[PDB]
Amino acid sequence: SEHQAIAKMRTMIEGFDDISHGGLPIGRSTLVSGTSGTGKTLFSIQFLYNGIIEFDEPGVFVTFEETPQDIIKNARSFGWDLAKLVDEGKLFILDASPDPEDLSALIERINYAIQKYRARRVSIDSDAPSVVRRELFRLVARLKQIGATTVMTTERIEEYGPIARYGVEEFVSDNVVILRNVLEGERRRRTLEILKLRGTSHMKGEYPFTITDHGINIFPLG
Amino acid sequence: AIAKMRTMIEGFDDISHGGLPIGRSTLVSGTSGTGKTLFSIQFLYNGIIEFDEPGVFVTFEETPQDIIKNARSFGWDLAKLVDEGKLFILDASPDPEGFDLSALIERINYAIQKYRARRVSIDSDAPSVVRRELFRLVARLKQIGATTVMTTERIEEYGPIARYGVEEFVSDNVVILRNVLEGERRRRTLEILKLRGTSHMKGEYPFTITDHGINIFP
Amino acid sequence: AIAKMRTMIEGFDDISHGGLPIGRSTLVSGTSGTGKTLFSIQFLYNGIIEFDEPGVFVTFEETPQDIIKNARSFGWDLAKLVDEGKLFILDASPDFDLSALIERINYAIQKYRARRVSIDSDAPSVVRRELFRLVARLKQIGATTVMTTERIEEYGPIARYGVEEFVSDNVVILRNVLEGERRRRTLEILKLRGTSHMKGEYPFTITDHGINIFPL
Amino acid sequence: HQAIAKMRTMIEGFDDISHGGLPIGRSTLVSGTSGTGKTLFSIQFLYNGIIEFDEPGVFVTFEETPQDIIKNARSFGWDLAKLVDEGKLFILDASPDPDLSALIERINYAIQKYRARRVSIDSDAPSVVRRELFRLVARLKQIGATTVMTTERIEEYGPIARYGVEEFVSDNVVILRNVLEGERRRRTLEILKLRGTSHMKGEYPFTITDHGINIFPL
Amino acid sequence: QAIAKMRTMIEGFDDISHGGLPIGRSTLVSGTSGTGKTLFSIQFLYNGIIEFDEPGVFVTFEETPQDIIKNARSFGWDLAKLVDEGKLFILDASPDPFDLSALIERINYAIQKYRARRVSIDSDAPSVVRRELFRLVARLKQIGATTVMTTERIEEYGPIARYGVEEFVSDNVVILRNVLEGERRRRTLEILKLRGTSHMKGEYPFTITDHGINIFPLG
Amino acid sequence: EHQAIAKMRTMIEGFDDISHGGLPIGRSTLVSGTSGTGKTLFSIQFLYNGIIEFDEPGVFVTFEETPQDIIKNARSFGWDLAKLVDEGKLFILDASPDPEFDLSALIERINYAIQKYRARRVSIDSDAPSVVRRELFRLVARLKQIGATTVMTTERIEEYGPIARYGVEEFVSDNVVILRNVLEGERRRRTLEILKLRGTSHMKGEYPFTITDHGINIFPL
Ligand SMILES: Nc1ncnc2c1ncn2[C@@H]1O[C@H](COP(=O)(O)OP(=O)(O)OP(O)(O)=S)[C@@H](O)[C@H]1O
Ligand SMILES: Nc1ncnc2c1ncn2[C@@H]1O[C@H](COP(=O)(O)OP(=O)(O)OP(O)(O)=S)[C@@H](O)[C@H]1O
Ligand SMILES: Nc1ncnc2c1ncn2[C@@H]1O[C@H](COP(=O)(O)OP(=O)(O)OP(O)(O)=S)[C@@H](O)[C@H]1O
Ligand SMILES: Nc1ncnc2c1ncn2[C@@H]1O[C@H](COP(=O)(O)OP(=O)(O)OP(O)(O)=S)[C@@H](O)[C@H]1O
Ligand SMILES: Nc1ncnc2c1ncn2[C@@H]1O[C@H](COP(=O)(O)OP(=O)(O)OP(O)(O)=S)[C@@H](O)[C@H]1O
Ligand SMILES: Nc1ncnc2c1ncn2[C@@H]1O[C@H](COP(=O)(O)OP(=O)(O)OP(O)(O)=S)[C@@H](O)[C@H]1O
Ligand SMILES: [Cl-]
Ligand SMILES: [Cl-]
Ligand SMILES: [Cl-]
Ligand SMILES: [Cl-]
Ligand SMILES: [Cl-]
Ligand SMILES: [Cl-]
Ligand SMILES: [Mg+2]
Ligand SMILES: [Mg+2]
Ligand SMILES: [Mg+2]
Ligand SMILES: [Mg+2]
Ligand SMILES: [Mg+2]
Ligand SMILES: [Mg+2]
């Protein structure tokens, strides 16, 4: 797949690089939306982990809720030692999680981390729609200027309803991935869809995946 | 990887691949009469009986006397467990005559140390406020090291996980109890929707409530 | 294991495995004309006639006179029970208001030595708060209470404000379901805290003798 | 066993469905979507009282003018103008020019003036609508009027009326439907509720023809 | 002395309505986008002029007269000629790229000026909308106009019009639908209600042709 | 004039058949769709074909995507827009947000570009409904005065719900096209529908299409 306009970097997540016809568009952001426990955080961690392990590309993980400590503990579920990557300066977890007890400043923290750690991959996890739209638009634009390739996760509450919470997120993003966890006849089945990738082709519709001891495994069928 | 403690609730430790994640909170959501209080009581009762692990039950609606009375239908002598100092029922109900999260936490905390409890149950208007408040309760409980069941309400069997559409997102673990109409009959089911950082069986599993509490069939 | 009082409403004590738990409140919710008031009235009437248990009926909209006139069609003479001091109808109907209501209810309960209470018919937090306090106080008093509420759909929320079923000990749902062009009445005990009951919907009719439920 | 007395509408089929007609001294809510026959039912009620039983009636209108009411009733061969001339029908015009306490006095005055037994009324907090409609029902009750009051609704199988409260404050509720299925319309009438008395249940098909409403109980 | 009807001469419609539109009254014609509302209102005036020499007033609130005229040439109708002959007046109430009373006075003036028998009107609180519409309807009735007034709706099988009140202050209601099923569109017309008179019930299929609306028998 | 409205060919395969000749001249066509339905692609292909096939210059007005991304992404369809910009055949007007709105002023700037580049085709890409309606009405009217033939895209959130976002856009527009991206049985199917063209005829309902290395391809029948 060399005849496409947009250079892509490989997630090395089994099956995803096939669905995306080469990986995530470089220097752009990809929205990854899903209901609770669909694998958003896992996808964003796996993106960073693979970048470090496979290509020695440093990553920055920005967390807004889960603590770094819990992110690290949970990744051990997959045999990933993120503490060691942090110790080696290859992974930086930026803690923006609220005190257990603005955006401008946040963006500067991110930029600082990206420069300090030489980061090539970024993951960001995770009331007026128009305000959300402009703020997200601003975040996306700043990351692009910096040159980062970014996964940003968002929540949604229905498997076949709005893409994210505010009805605007999918429109200001260059790339949109939807993780679903569909309940039918009392069974759950996980799927991944690439809804859009601006300027390039991709496989369409839903593709099954599982979450196992090895992380996400996606199965393309086309 | 995260360790789990056995609930000894029949069938549940299979569905959860070992029980509830230790040192974390598990959200248990369901419409009215789905078995939420029962699940949270059975969690502490089995902790005491099977493992000599004391428990703290935090009630916001039902009086301790009613919690005790309602458990007799299952042959659980909760009055005896309270008399022995193995179960503490913390009453946080608003007295019909005459909210601060930080006070509750300290009371829970001292109860935990006083009774040397390993297991806690908590039973049970801006979504953004709810989200932040729940996030703080979960964090503070985690800081104490308590393994906690916390129940919440929902109003549809196949709609939102909880009431404000945010509860499942700040919870580490989520269990849904349903009570579904099948023709004119009801069918109860239990689902483990998610457990962060660990594995579990997927989808719904039928259960019944009997004289011995919750009985699940994987 | 918990003591129940018999409603003597045909079929209902079978569905509730012996009647309504004594000293607790039971929510009875339904759309319009589902039989809520009838259930409430029958609960008190049977208590008086069969068990000499006095009752207090609390009405918020229907006048005492219409309550009495409507019951008359079931052959139930409520005016006579009121005359004998076995029934008190408390008129709360229009031209903490709650605390004033509670005190009035308490007084009637003490005065008439009532064992049974029926209460016939905005922000969720406020509703939940007020209702919880009403229920808690009746419990302290030791009343066994039927509390009716409205709902607007047969298979939607239990009651109007989405909280009523969560603060009640017991929940009964009266439905009047349209199937094709025919109506079918059903009763369901959704929940009885601390005890067993039959599950799901059971058909009933309303006749000259009141509610008649068939649980088999 | 003392029955609720009823007065016959002589609307064909309806006195079978209602087991004798409308409850005397009370108000019956007649609700439906646009063009379901609400006004027709309310007029046929008054017209039949006058012609069959020599019971005069008051028609209270809030939007259609008297002249249009009269004009439209000509469709069915009824001469309302003549009945107004004879003092047997009074159309009370409460329609706006291109409050409730005042209206009630107006209606009471008209009832007393014309020996009227039958009244038809044709036709934003839900809480205030509820309390206001309640008062209207109550004062009509004291006068001893037997009243048809129409309301609008916007869905064939949605709320009984517009504000989700009107059915709960009415003693009696009739629903007129105009159901669209597979490009064809079907008129049905349902008596949902009559407090204190019996009635047939569910929907009964009807047509509107040159003779007004014809209901088919079989 | 039941209410009489004026023929629309719209193929199929006068059968459905058992004679046409009730004279001296207003008929609501509601529909989703591109359902044929303007076409119906224009064809009503056009046929009145061509068949009965009854002059018409068309009141436009968005579309310019120029575009109304231009679009009607799709059907082989020369509205510019009819305006020039004084048979039709297109009253421009469209805004430059609200007082209902003033509008009503302009419509009355036009009806008197052109001796019009036929009028088409194309096209925040419901209580306000209800009151204003009722006023407009009442005033057109006192004038003696037979009126078609179009309204928008956003669902094919949802409310009649946008505010949930328009169908209740209208004497007459026609619904145009453009139903999408299995990737194909089907146009239908329904007479929902005609106060004080009879009409056929349910949906009737129609097409928009080079010569305007054609309505066919059920099915 | 005395003729029914004339149309300009889009040369988008299959579309000029569906529209019986192309887009109505001197008017605006709304093109609405959920995310990634091909709205920007449709609006670019309209300008691109105008330039290449008829030497009709074009103005593209972008409200969020930067000109440089518009140009970069169009390379996916084999089009060199930078070359067209260099030759003065295409002008991309950047109305996108400074990362850290007066439609009347914007309209005048669109007019400058239209007059400067002698453009015949315009594409515009892409919360009180009364306010939306009035502003959209004024934009449509001013474009019609200028005489431009315009594609304007809008967003929608459901495949079979509202045409656009505010329930008014499809009513003030002369022409409406809906792009859908329907998910059934885990597969997506793209369709195009011409819902309405005031004053002229068109085929009805949905027609399937794909996006290829040569742009939009609407299947026959
Ligand atoms: N070793 C494992 N084997 C199988 N499944 C696992 C394993 N570890 C974790 N999981 C699953 O992965 C899910 C967690 O995925 P996450 O990426 O944390 O979800 P999420 O979409 O970020 O959800 P939130 O943030 O809690 S709403 C758990 O709910 C389990 O189903
Ligand atoms: N060479 C290609 N072959 C096949 N599909 C392609 C190709 N290039 C792009 N696409 C598709 O075109 C889509 C982008 O189309 P656009 O016109 O940008 O959609 P859009 O409706 O404008 O979406 P927005 O503005 O991001 S909401 C991508 O999501 C791909 O699916
Ligand atoms: N001995 C028993 N046998 C069978 N079912 C029982 C028995 N005891 C209780 N139950 C059932 O258990 C239900 C009570 O379960 P709970 O755990 O109190 O429900 P809950 O979900 O907490 O409901 P709330 O708090 O009132 S909304 C009752 O409604 C009965 O159906
Ligand atoms: N003698 C009777 N025989 C048969 N059915 C009767 C008789 N009396 C009343 N009914 C029925 O009982 C219904 C009234 O039941 P209620 O208990 O008053 O209803 P409800 O749920 O309280 O309704 P509200 O308060 O008006 S919303 C009537 O609508 C009839 O269908
Ligand atoms: N002679 C007739 N033959 C058959 N149907 C008729 C005849 N006269 C009137 N109708 C029908 O009766 C309907 C009018 O009934 P109404 O009682 O005015 O309805 P409505 O429910 O009061 O509607 P509103 O007030 O306009 S919302 C018309 O729409 C016709 O369908
Ligand atoms: N010659 C023609 N042959 C066939 N159909 C035509 C012809 N001319 C126009 N049409 C159709 O008529 C429709 C326009 O009808 P209108 O009366 O303008 O609809 P409308 O309901 O008023 O839409 P608005 O006002 O834009 S929401 C177009 O969308 C075409 O489908
Ligand atoms: Cl899985
Ligand atoms: Cl059970
Ligand atoms: Cl019955
Ligand atoms: Cl009919
Ligand atoms: Cl057609
Ligand atoms: Cl495609
Ligand atoms: Mg996560
Ligand atoms: Mg409980
Ligand atoms: Mg009642
Ligand atoms: Mg009427
Ligand atoms: Mg139009
Ligand atoms: Mg775009």
Tab-separated table of C-alpha atoms in Angstrom, chain F residues 4 9 28 36 38 47 51 90 104-105 109-110 114 135 141 183 202 210 220:
chain	number	residue	atom	x	y	z
F	4	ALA	CA	-36.607	26.531	-16.518
F	9	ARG	CA	-22.130	19.507	-14.963
F	28	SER	CA	-26.450	26.718	-3.660
F	36	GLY	CA	-16.317	10.942	6.962
F	38	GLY	CA	-17.296	12.404	1.612
F	47	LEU	CA	-14.252	22.644	-8.134
F	51	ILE	CA	-11.203	23.820	-13.555
F	90	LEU	CA	-8.184	27.750	-7.651
F	104	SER	CA	-21.382	39.544	6.507
F	105	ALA	CA	-17.684	40.412	6.462
F	109	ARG	CA	-14.120	38.494	1.231
F	110	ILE	CA	-15.631	35.550	-0.682
F	114	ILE	CA	-14.784	35.355	-6.755
F	135	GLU	CA	-27.728	33.732	8.738
F	141	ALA	CA	-29.050	35.060	-1.001
F	183	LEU	CA	-23.834	0.470	9.028
F	202	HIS	CA	-33.969	14.676	-10.376
F	210	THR	CA	-17.667	4.393	-3.310
F	220	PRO	CA	-25.316	3.014	-12.181
